[PDB]
């Protein structure tokens, strides 16, 4: 129809002249319109079949095809393809049709396929270990969460060693223990921390107005990184400011910190082993960096990560926590779905900046300015003092 | 924003100006612009947190929720909902914060919940029970396929008996078979019958010329309703033509045909157990009829079904297989991913329209007359004689 190419035009347009703020703001109205205008037969066939993407896209990651085919420069028919990766020549032809309908691939005229916006990220390692991620870890997670609250009658889950994590995986273990006694989930989460999500905190962080007339002198330390994964905050933080005197610390686990060590730059980051269960070793840091950390814990244990640093903080000091801050109403899909998913296999959840504040006054801390710097779905860092 | 309302106002004036399928070509291409104006990181978070919809309408459904929801004639905050159906109230706030976002209920200004489309459709029983198949029988076989494929080398499917259905319920039976052996989900696949697609076939089949000067007389049957579950065909059949003379015959296993007789009429429909792995009893009828049929079955089984209606056929009799008939190139997602679900749960296919006629050609049938009636996703009724 000549209608539906006159929106399309339209979208793209207005896309375009927008920011990725705006674009998202677009993809989410897309969405409601769709699912407003679906019949009920619709809905139920949308339900049942967007099931299939993960399925098809780890098949597709464990044929190296999206690999294969961002690197090909000219199209590829259904036999090669089948051919050159070891799959069945049927069982290819029918997996590219139904990626070429989800925009997994791109089909041409003479049915032949390339890569599309969606090949090329499923073929950045970082990426793709998200998506199996979701297939080996969560998947399994959320199957087993209807038919684990009916047992328990539906309780508030509250307890990382008492959610569906426990029933899907056959253990009493929690998530983080268990994940150690399993070599090639570890390997796929080693990968999945080399993803750097954009943009970041200091996008719009006032690292000068924050810092007010705190010294570095003797030789404090300006930026600790707990639980900083590959390092990302700190190597954007001596790339923004690095005249910035003050010693920049990334904190993590042996395993992670080796890993680390290929992208670190030679030198201004520190790297230390430390277990943000254990008392802060650092003295008189000026920001205390925890991001993406403490949604994964109930807030009986977020606490405890808070409460061993609070003892490690002048007045000048500050506690920093990057993460989500979903609104109290109208939240997106992008938070409200990491809320199930979190509560099924960590028993954590999501918090308002209401219920940061309020887990914040428990260690002590209160809330002295919070700077978004994503837009609709809310990731801010928020900065906290004591008194 | 002031933009996104006017894309959602402008979009909904143009969808009640068409039809349902002009709509359905407005929601494909929401679908086609989402996904080409996400970032790599939502193409990712995408996939990972769309499953949660069935797992979370599952939840629902255990509740009662959404029939509770819909017969509400006042909003509802999360606690009241929370103490008449039993579940924790803050487990029942993050699932409706949850459900909010998706479209599944309404949340207000005030934060509380009212039914939206998405609310009415899972209230309905039929459409209910699509969506329970989706999570129990569904979900766990597509669970399986990714390693299944690895294990035997990513192999062609075309056996019912040898796919990711026997690796995902540790069985050796067929989907059919061990169907019968669970008590709960044959209920539910029961239920699950009484959903009436539409439209069907009869709003383009042209009866009367197909019909021609075909005599009833003696008591020849003019429609025969093989696997007709609940006989929604025939009784439409009834309705639209009530004084085209002949027998309208439905035919099914007796527990199902038991169970439609709550909906059938009083007379004008007779109800007969048959197998149709087995000869057809009835001779000579106009119209044999196969709908959502041969769908479910590879080719060698579906020949044998076609086969065995074959000798009961005169030379003005006709089969009428309605199934899906997808294009050569550009199928889409709703007729891509059955494929994918069908291939894995019982080792058959879509076909498209030649796929159809060689399955045909190795029965004796030759295609004369395609009468689709959806669009863009195409359901038709195609019509075969012998020779
Ligand atoms: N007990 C513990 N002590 C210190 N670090 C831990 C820990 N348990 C998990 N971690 C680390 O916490 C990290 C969470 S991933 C978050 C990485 C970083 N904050 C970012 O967003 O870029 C992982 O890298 C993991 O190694
Ligand atoms: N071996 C068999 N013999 C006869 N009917 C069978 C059968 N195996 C399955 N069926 C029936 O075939 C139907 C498939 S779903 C049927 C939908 C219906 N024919 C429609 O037009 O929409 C079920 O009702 C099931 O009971």
Request: glycine share 6%; charged share 20%; hydrophobic share 40%.
């Amino acid at each position: 129809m000549e209608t539906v190419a006159a929106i399309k035009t339209l979208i793209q347009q207005l896309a375009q002249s927008t920011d990725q703020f705006g674009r998202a703001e677009i993809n989410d109205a897309l969405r409601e319109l769709q699912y407003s205008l679906e019949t009920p037969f619709d809905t139920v066939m949308r339900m049942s079949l967007d099931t299939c993407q993960v399925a098809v896209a780890r098949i597709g990651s464990d044929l190296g095809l999206f690999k294969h085919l961002s690197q090909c420069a000219s199209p590829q028919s259904a036999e090669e393809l089948a051919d050159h990766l070891g799959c069945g020549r049927e069982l290819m032809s029918r997996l590219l049709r139904y990626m070429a309908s989800v925009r997994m691939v791109q089909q041409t005229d003479d049915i032949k396929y390339i890569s599309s916006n969606i090949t090329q990220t499923l073929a950045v390692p970082g990426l793709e270990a998200g998506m199996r991620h979701a297939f080996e870890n969560l998947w399994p997670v959320l199957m087993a969460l209807p038919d684990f609250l009916a047992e328990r009658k539906y309780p508030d889950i509250v307890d990382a060693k008492d959610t569906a994590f426990q029933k899907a995986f056959n253990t009493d273990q929690d998530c983080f223990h268990w994940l150690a006694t399993q070599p090639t989930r570890i390997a796929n989460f080693k990968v999945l921390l080399t993803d750097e999500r954009t943009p970041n905190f200091l996008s719009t962080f006032p690292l000068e107005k924050e810092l007010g007339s705190w010294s570095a002198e003797p030789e404090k330390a300006l930026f600790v990184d707990i639980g900083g994964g590959m390092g990302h905050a700190c190597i954007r933080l001596r790339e923004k400011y690095p005249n910035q005197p003050g010693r920049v610390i990334l904190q993590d686990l042996p395993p992670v910190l080796q890993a680390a060590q290929a992208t670190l730059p030679l030198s201004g980051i520190e790297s230390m082993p430390h277990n943000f269960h254990t008392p802060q070793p650092v003295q008189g840091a000026k920001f205390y960096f925890l991001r993406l950390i403490l949604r994964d814990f109930p807030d009986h244990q977020a606490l405890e990560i808070l409460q061993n640093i609070v003892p490690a903080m002048d007045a000048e000091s500050r506690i920093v926590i990057d993460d989500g801050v979903p609104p109290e109403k109208g939240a997106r899909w992008a938070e409200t779905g990491t809320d199930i998913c979190i509560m099924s296999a960590l028993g954590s959840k999501e918090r308002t900046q209401r219920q940061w504040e309020e887990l914040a006054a428990k260690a002590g801390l209160q809330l002295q300015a919070l700077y978004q710097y994503t837009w609709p779905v809310v990731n801010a860092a928020m900065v906290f003092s004591l008194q």
